[PDB]
UniProtKB/Swiss-Prot annotation, chains A, B, C, D:
It comes from Streptomyces avidinii. This is Streptavidin. The biological function of streptavidin is not known. Forms a strong non-covalent specific complex with biotin (one molecule of biotin per subunit of streptavidin). The keyword Glycosyltransferase does not apply. One of its GO terms (molecular function) is biotin binding. Keywords: Biotin, Secreted, Signal. It comes from the Bacteria. Belongs to the avidin/streptavidin family. The chain holds residues 39 to 158 of 183 of the full protein. GO terms for cellular component: extracellular region. The keyword Secreted applies. It is found in: Secreted.
Amino acid sequence: RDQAGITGTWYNQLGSTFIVTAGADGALTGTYESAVGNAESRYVLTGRYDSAPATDGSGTALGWTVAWKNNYRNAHSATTWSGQYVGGAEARINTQWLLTSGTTEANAWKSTLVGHDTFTKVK
Amino acid sequence: RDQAGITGTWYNQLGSTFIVTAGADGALTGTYESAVGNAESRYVLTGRYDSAPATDGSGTALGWTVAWKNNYRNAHSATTWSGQYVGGAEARINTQWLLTSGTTEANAWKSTLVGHDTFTKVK
Amino acid sequence: RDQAGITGTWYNQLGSTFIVTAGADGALTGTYESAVGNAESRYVLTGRYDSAPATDGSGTALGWTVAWKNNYRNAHSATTWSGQYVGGAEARINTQWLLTSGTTEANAWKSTLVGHDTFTKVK
Amino acid sequence: RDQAGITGTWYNQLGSTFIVTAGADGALTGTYESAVGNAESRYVLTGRYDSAPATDGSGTALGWTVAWKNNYRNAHSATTWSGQYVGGAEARINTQWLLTSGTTEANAWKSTLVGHDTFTKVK
């Protein structure tokens, strides 16, 4: 359906790079590279998407997770993106995300950042 | 290494059931069963956790995704949970989540729900 | 003091209209008109802003609330916008918002929408 | 009817103190004292609530803002709480909040925290 649509390389407004493969069973697998934060190189990501979306012009729901540990760095944090893929000439993934840091119980109240990223197939 | 800590069955305050295995490499895999919403039986989930957390009493960052499609129902949506695992006699996973529905462009502004779930090892 | 800066008429990407006065004490007062949702005409808003922001190029923190009741409609809901004002040739208010509906205890899990609006001084 | 219900002193799970008056026109006014963060003493708050709630056992929607500047400190930030007031023997205000810091454009991605507070009439 959108499996072909989704699979490939995406960029967000920060210059981060998202490389993903969409499986026929709804799986998402790939790597993420962040242009910001104390992140370097590629980090693993896994997620899911609606492999049988509605056919009424709705987007396709999806989400994925990155834990910010790889062989170079550990930020002791994880981001999840939740959003929808929108096909067409200017195909986009529109997301909102939550970034939770490991914290003490005392600092739990400020453990979580929220934002929005838009991914396109170019730049 | 909260690998043993994380792996197993969890319940949230809504009576939902989260069954997960934590891999040594930081993978999360399993199934989710929602006590509420347009949902029935088990749905696949995947995610990531920090397999080398800080040793200072901080929690362990983690997240995962469910796409609300299985052999019974398709809600045309996906939830991501972002949060942290806290060990100890009453181990908890404390989360915030985003639930995005596939929508038309005109309804995109109301595509996404936000909430918080707390998971424990009993009920 | 972005008091001058903030006061006036703003528009977001949905074609909604925000009219606000900033008081020297940090008050925000005005009316909001939503292009979308179960809304008509103007609704009162109130909020606060940092009336003595950092001088280092940072934006100015602010937020406001609208309850979606006026003489025409009642949507039994309230939105808060939280964001920052950024001055300059293309002045912006960048926001994230939570919209909570009054619900039964059984539907509380889906009480709240989350989004992002960007406001500019034209269109 | 919740004017009376809402008006008064409230405490959240962090030991913060929220003092509010609900006006008949849907206004909320008062002060907030945070038990955590870079905060001391009282800060002004303003907001709105649905003064004509549904009669079907639904909660009453409301929200309010605090800018974290007073005569003692300036944290260059603002929190909005969005949620609902639930009446009865153990009356609650159940909220989700966004805390936005003033930042440079380069740090704007990490400008906003998200959380949840529950307020009760005791402790």
